[PDB]
Design a protein around this ligand. Structure first.
Ligand SMILES: [Ca+2]
Ligand SMILES: [Ca+2]
Ligand SMILES: [Ca+2]
Ligand SMILES: [Ca+2]
Lengths: 387, 387
């Protein structure tokens, strides 16, 4: 006996440079309406994981970190919030869904999905204009604001706003990551540190907890320039192994793990990235990024490979770190106080703003801001074999 | 000033080791219900192409040949057929949909889709048992038969049938490719030819038109063992170019194209593949394929890269060629008469049957047979901006 597949109401969306499968909590099977193995098993099967072929041909996944993602949204019980946002990074190779972080790219899609699916107080949705969606990011306990355009009572998806890494234009969605610093911003208590990896090297690093726990290293310390593309790194097993050990040692120094061996099973956080001063390069689309077009270069890894553009959470970490004089990110951008930076990633450029202000002689960051876009790709029902 | 996206009823399915977006003809926007610019533009946009980033983040595509596919199905008005099947291979990088060939992997999905969407006379569907779907493959003008299991009047999707390259088991769907040889099996009139490839060299090749036009060369004559996985070839841009030049010159030699430059925008057909005698190797999943487990090894390229498993149409070409004594495929399997072969591809093994009969010095093949599986991944509506 092999019962028919179940059907679960879902929407497949692009948010920024990421793709995800979005669910209303109430649309999930009863067993999956709370965190736990039942929920994880459903999401794993929807995506096509675990997959020893690493192709996700038997699911909704695209076999990359940017395309192996799930989102569960529900009404909020938090004061001054409209929607609760839970994000699951679905492992391609392991039966594991990681709930330890946010997805900054899908935030624009979160706002749109909430409006389109009855998760926002109707009084907050104008007939035309802007719907300000106040998102409670339930993974990290942070407020994120999405300013979603509205036309004729519906989300305005289409438009002429272009973002590097996104093939086609769409409507601009402004996002505000409120109070991004973990609440410490710098867990080591230092703006810069030296990560000692005995027998491998010594590496200047800034370790910051804002957007997502992130370790920034200088490109030159790795023999890189910061202009590298995926093909320069992602077939280099030695380089990948090196990034992973530095990430592990950074995780230990940040107090995110107690023993170095824990890093193997904790792949999603912290992120590791490398920075450099402005330099001209051809992006992955063949478009020239001039040194004059950027304040710095940043490349980041996700789930053990160089990311094709930039993770939204990592973009928050870049903006926040750039606003603090003396961080490796700030110094790559020429030092001094900074309200915003435009950085060069493999697919082009991204501008992120972060207002740092002194209070009691210490830096505080009110918010980090960026613009993304989002659109529905498919809507209806996903199917999996009966649980 | 920017109209909403349109909704198009569609089903996203896995068929064999491929994923595709399936449409009823009548569900398409009127402009796309005939061949031409409007249809190709729509399918490109659904998939997320052309994409200079080569990631298909802004569409249904998975940025690989196995995952950049569209299918248009309708009830057949042709005598002795149930469903008209039109397959479009959507280019990742170019504004092109290739209509020159079939997709053998998606054939099982075509049968299931036809049953589930009223494209076959209900009187032909048993309440419980197997529904024999007669498919008119409209790209190549051939009959293909799909034997789809039925439970309680609906397609039985789930089951315990396992196929190398498919993550999870599903219901077995037996497929029959009727009279696979082109209306000639060997367009050159020879079982093995010397293919002259200007700027590269000359190669012994079997060029066969069955399932899909295919050029077969010995692994050793290209400097390979036949045990190669994707990482051994797909980052070797010199090797890839060499393959493409040979593929182009083979296309010309087979009379598929009139001029060598036509191969640039005819990428789906012909295919190029290399063969070897049985050898042990670890598959892409880490599973050992023992030499005793197979009759030969075959690796094939699709759209310029080594394929992750095997194309279904190339599997037909392999089975058919193996059945004709003296082809490079037959010789790789040790020669003599063969009614079926199991070959090793990067993902494991696949068995194909194709009995050949000799009369008056000529071999004919009534049918090529293999088993696949299919399942619905998502159903509902895809969205694209208003055309
Ligand atoms: Ca990628
Ligand atoms: Ca293919
Ligand atoms: Ca129709
Ligand atoms: Ca592939």
């Amino acid at each position: 006996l092999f019962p028919p597949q179940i059907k679960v109401a879902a929407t497949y969306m692009r948010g920024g440079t990421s793709k995800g499968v979005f669910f209303r909590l109430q649309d999930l099977p009863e067993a999956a309406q709370v965190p736990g193995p039942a929920r994880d098993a459903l999401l794993l099967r929807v995506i096509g994981s675990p997959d020893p072929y690493a192709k996700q041909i038997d699911g909704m996944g695209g076999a990359t970190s940017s395309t192996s993602k799930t989102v569960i949204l529900s009404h909020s019980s938090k004061a001054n919030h409209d929607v609760d946002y839970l994000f699951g990074q679905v492992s391609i190779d392991k039966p594991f869904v990681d709930w330890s972080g946010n997805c900054g790219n899908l935030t624009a899609a979160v706002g749109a999905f909430a409006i389109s699916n009855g998760l926002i107080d109707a009084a907050r949705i104008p007939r035309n204009g802007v719907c300000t969606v106040r998102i409670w990011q339930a993974n990290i306990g942070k407020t994120i604001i999405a300013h979603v355009p509205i036309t004729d009572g519906a989300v305005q998806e289409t438009g002429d706003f272009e973002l590097d890494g996104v093939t086609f234009p769409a409507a601009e969605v402004q996002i505000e990551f409120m109070n991004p610093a973990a609440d410490c911003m710098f867990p080591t208590g230092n703006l810069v540190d030296v990560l000692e990896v005995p027998g491998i090297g010594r590496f200047n690093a800034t370790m910051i907890n804002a957007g997502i726990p992130t370790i920034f290293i200088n490109a030159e310390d790795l023999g890189y320039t910061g202009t590298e593309l995926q093909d320069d790194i992602n077939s280099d097993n030695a380089a990948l192994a090196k990034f992973e050990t530095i990430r592990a040692h950074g995780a230990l120094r940040m107090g995110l793990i107690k023993h170095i061996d824990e890093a193997a099973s904790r792949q999603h956080t912290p992120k590791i990235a490398f920075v450099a001063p402005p330099k001209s390069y051809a992006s992955s689309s063949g478009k020239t990024v001039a040194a004059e077009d950027v304040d710095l270069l940043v490349r980041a890894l996700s789930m053990g490979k160089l990311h094709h553009a930039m993770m939204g959470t990592a973009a928050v970490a870049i903006g926040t770190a750039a606003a603090i004089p003396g961080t490796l990110v700030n110094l790559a951008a020429g030092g001094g106080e900074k309200e915003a930076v435009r950085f060069g990633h493999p697919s082009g450029t991204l501008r992120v703003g972060a207002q740092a202000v002194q209070e009691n002689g210490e830096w505080t960051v009110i918010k980090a801001i960026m613009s993304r876009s989002a659109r529905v790709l498919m809507e209806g029902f996903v199917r999996v074999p009966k649980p």
